[PDB]
Design a protein around this nucleic acid. Structure first.
Ligand code: MG
Ligand code: MG
Ligand code: MG
Ligand code: MG
Ligand code: MG
Ligand code: MG
Ligand code: MG
Ligand code: MG
Ligand code: MG
Ligand code: MG
Ligand code: MG
Ligand code: MG
Ligand code: MG
Ligand code: MG
Ligand code: MG
Ligand code: MG
Ligand code: MG
Ligand code: MG
Ligand code: ZN
Lengths: 142, 38, 209, 176
RNA sequence: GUGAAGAGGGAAACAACCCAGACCGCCAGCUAAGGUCCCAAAGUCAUGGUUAAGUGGGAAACGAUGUGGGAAGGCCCAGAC
RNA sequence: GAUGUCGGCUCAUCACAUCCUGGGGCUGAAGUAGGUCCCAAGGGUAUGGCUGUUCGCCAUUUAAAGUGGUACGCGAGCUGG
RNA sequence: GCUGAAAGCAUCUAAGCACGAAACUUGCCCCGAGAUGAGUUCUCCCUGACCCUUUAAGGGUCCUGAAGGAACGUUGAAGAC
């Protein structure tokens, strides 16, 4: 028989809450990408988002090691010559805290539509409150 | 101060110190002796 | 402080006793009517909406009319919003007049600049023309080079090129308020302001001063 | 090391309060607080304070010598005062106090009017003498530094704001 | 020796380097170099240490109470630094 | 089986080994003005005479008339000395 | 520079604290929800019959045709269209 392929009409995605307080950014980001992709599931089919929805609370309190709070630099380009823009980790945490975990997780996911699609199931929050109580999300310790 | 790859005590009153990963020489007697590695 | 909406009547001068001619733009500031008070709870920021002037009942649409009717104000020609600085309160139906500029000395005026259509580089960007003669073949007011050679290998973004010029929002700042005429609904502002005679103007006190 | 291993003796009339790392001391000069690094056990075991490292912290003894010097300055600071003087030099230089403000005149076109913190007090027995008093040792050197920063002593004549401790080395101008 | 006349895997990508020589087929299995946190298959493996520089992940003479380890040795309770 | 080569013009863009402006240490730094090094690339950064010139000399300016990369930037944009 | 050990001292630094530039983030102006992460607020409109069959966000008939929009025309200190 041909091996199993998940079908995204029948795929079941569960909802999980995660706290990011005190957790290493990279170490945390990897488990979300794993779970967002569906690698933790035996029905993993890499052209199918078998993954799960995750809420991340307290993105503002994700931890980093070393001197990376001051020295990790997020670079981006605007598309205008000379438009190389900088932001340290602490300036990002200060201005758009949810972006620090979203950028890390986007880098760890596949590149392409399905990867873009897996990323939609991540809902990052800077505080301890989310508005998806209706989805009945389970606690998950990373 | 004078900034060079080689920083040295030039008198007894000189003193080596590292301040932000930077070898410096402070002297209490001669500001000419102030040095920063760089 | 909030600002007020008016209309460009035109330019004139104010002679002073001392001998000075002051060019002024005359701004007709009819009474501004508050149509909506947005607050931090329901809207997420503190501003007021205003209308001024008049529109035909026959040209007001039903969505516009309910919005005017909820405020209990007469339909004006447009809707403009002004943010509030945490002390200034306003109520729906409140009529604000040009007297608000009584104590202000300098105002910023914004309008839609006169439209010049498809403008060349010479006009739009102060591009210097090339030689009228001395050999020039068909390249008198043309822009010249638009870049480098097989290293960027493309035209960079924001390159000053020919196109639409004017017909855009322009703010002219720190304009001396010459006179406030409340009984005649006029603001006199030293100097030119953007746009054509008969055009909507927004007048606010000067941020910088 | 030697700094940490010498115990901090508290004299009569200083109530002490160890809430873990956060530690405050009360005295006649007033309450002073510190929040020590995690690597410092601080203990009541006598009419003294003892300083030594908490296993699990490589710095350890370094912090305990720091902590020792701090509390010692605090314990001294709440009982007795810290006092830094500053002498003004300059023909037309002078200082005056208005209450929590020192109005310095130091050859500037503007007036220098420096604002003091909560627990520092400045008098002036002379036009050209500032005398700070405070429980904290760090704040009173920070304030005396700031006042010294407006007109820091220049070498040739020694004109500016000097600590009365300060000895100034005077040089002679380029010949001819 | 390889390429030329040599595919496959690895070295990000990379004729000539490393592994290895494709008769065809298989939705079987063991390995090579190289690798096993995510993109990306496999250890967030185990024990002992080193590094705090993102060194690792570009660069020399020379410079320096960085830090680890080793061999000794001078001064030291006739009191030293 | 063609990638048009000097200089000019037009339009520029990056780098910083910074010419000016800004911040600073040492000075054989009294002051004025300098010297030298450190940080800093935000903005700004001549017109003319002679020559095809780049350059350079000269005249007179300017806060300054920076140094280099971009096919010694730019001829499907101009010129063609 | 302050306090300050490691290193009884000293030390701007290791802990901790403060000053510090046209660079950086803002503040000023303009675009800006195709920001597919497509957001918010206010207001307006639509409140009928049923047939069918693989009964499913299904297709068809009759009646209804709104808010509003577009078209057309007169046109504009808006404009290549
Ligand atoms: Mg891929
Ligand atoms: Mg027009
Ligand atoms: Mg012609
Ligand atoms: Mg390219
Ligand atoms: Mg051949
Ligand atoms: Mg490959
Ligand atoms: Mg195997
Ligand atoms: Mg191996
Ligand atoms: Mg894997
Ligand atoms: Mg492990
Ligand atoms: Mg490296
Ligand atoms: Mg530099
Ligand atoms: Mg800026
Ligand atoms: Mg010349
Ligand atoms: Mg250039
Ligand atoms: Mg060329
Ligand atoms: Mg060309
Ligand atoms: Mg010729
Ligand atoms: Zn010396």
């Amino acid at each position: 028989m041909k091996t199993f392929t998940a079908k995204p009409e029948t795929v079941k995605r569960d909802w999980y809450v995660v706290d990011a307080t005190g957790k290493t950014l990279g170490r945390l980001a990897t488990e979300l990408a794993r779970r967002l992709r569906g690698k933790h599931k035996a029905e993993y089919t890499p052209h199918v988002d078998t993954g799960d929805y995750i809420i991340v609370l307290n993105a503002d309190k994700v931890a980093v090691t070393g001197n990376k709070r001051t020295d990790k630099v997020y670079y981006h380009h605007t598309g205008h010559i000379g438009g190389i823009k900088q932001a340290t980790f602490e300036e990002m945490i200060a201005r758009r805290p949810e972006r620090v975990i979203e950028i890390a997780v986007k880098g760890m996911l596949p590149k392409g539509p399905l990867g873009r699609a897996m990323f939609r199931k991540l809902k990052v929050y800077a505080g301890n409150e989310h508005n998806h109580a209706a989805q009945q999300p389970q606690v998950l310790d990373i | 101060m004078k900034v060079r790859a080689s920083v040295k005590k030039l008198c007894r009153n000189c003193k080596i110190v590292k301040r932000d990963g930077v070898i410096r020489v402070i002297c209490s007697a001669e500001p000419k002796h102030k040095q920063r590695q760089g | 402080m909030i600002g007020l909406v008016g209309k460009k009547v035109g330019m004139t001068r104010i002679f002073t006793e001392d001998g000075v001619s002051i060019p002024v733009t005359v701004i007709e500031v009819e009474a501004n009517r508050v149509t909506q008070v947005k607050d931090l709870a329901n809207d997420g920021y503190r501003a007021i909406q205003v209308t001024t002037g008049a529109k035909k009942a026959n040209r007001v649409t039903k969505p516009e009319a309910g919005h005017f009717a909820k405020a209990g104000v007469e339909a004006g020609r447009g809707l403009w919003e002004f943010r509030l600085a945490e002390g200034e309160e306003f109520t729906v139906g409140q009529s604000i007049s040009v007297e608000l500029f009584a104590d202000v000395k300098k105002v910023d005026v914004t309008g839609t600049s006169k439209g010049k259509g498809f403008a060349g580089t010479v006009k739009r960007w102060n591009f210097r023309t090339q030689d009228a003669t001395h050999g020039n073949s068909l390249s008198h007011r043309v822009p010249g080079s638009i870049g480098q050679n097989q290293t960027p290998g493309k035209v960079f973004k924001g390159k000053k090129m020919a196109g639409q010029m004017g017909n855009e929002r322009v703010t002219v700042q720190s304009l001396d308020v010459v006179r406030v005429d409340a009984e005649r609904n006029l603001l006199l502002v030293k100097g030119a302001v953007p746009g054509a005679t008969g055009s909507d103007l927004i007048v606010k006190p000067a941020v910088k001063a | 090391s030697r700094v940490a291993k010498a115990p901090v003796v508290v004299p009569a009339g200083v109530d002490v309060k160890i809430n873990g790392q956060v530690i405050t001391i009360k005295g006649k000069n007033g309450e002073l607080t510190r929040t020590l690094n995690d690597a410092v056990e601080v203990k009541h075991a006598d009419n003294t304070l003892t300083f030594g490292p908490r296993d699990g912290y490589a710095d350890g003894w370094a912090q305990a010598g720091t902590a020792r010097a701090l509390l010692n300055s605090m314990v001294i600071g709440v009982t007795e005062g810290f006092t830094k003087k500053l002498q003004l030099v300059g023909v037309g230089y002078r200082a005056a106090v208005k209450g929590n403000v020192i109005n310095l005149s130091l050859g500037f076109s503007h007036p220098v009017d420096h604002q003091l913190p909560a627990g520092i007090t400045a008098e002036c027995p002379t036009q050209t003498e500032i005398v700070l008093k405070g429980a904290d040792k760090q704040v009173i050197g920070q304030v005396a530094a700031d006042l010294r920063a407006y007109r820091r002593p220049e070498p040739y004549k020694g004109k500016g704001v000097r600590y009365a401790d300060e000895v100034v080395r005077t040089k002679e101008a380029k010949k001819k």
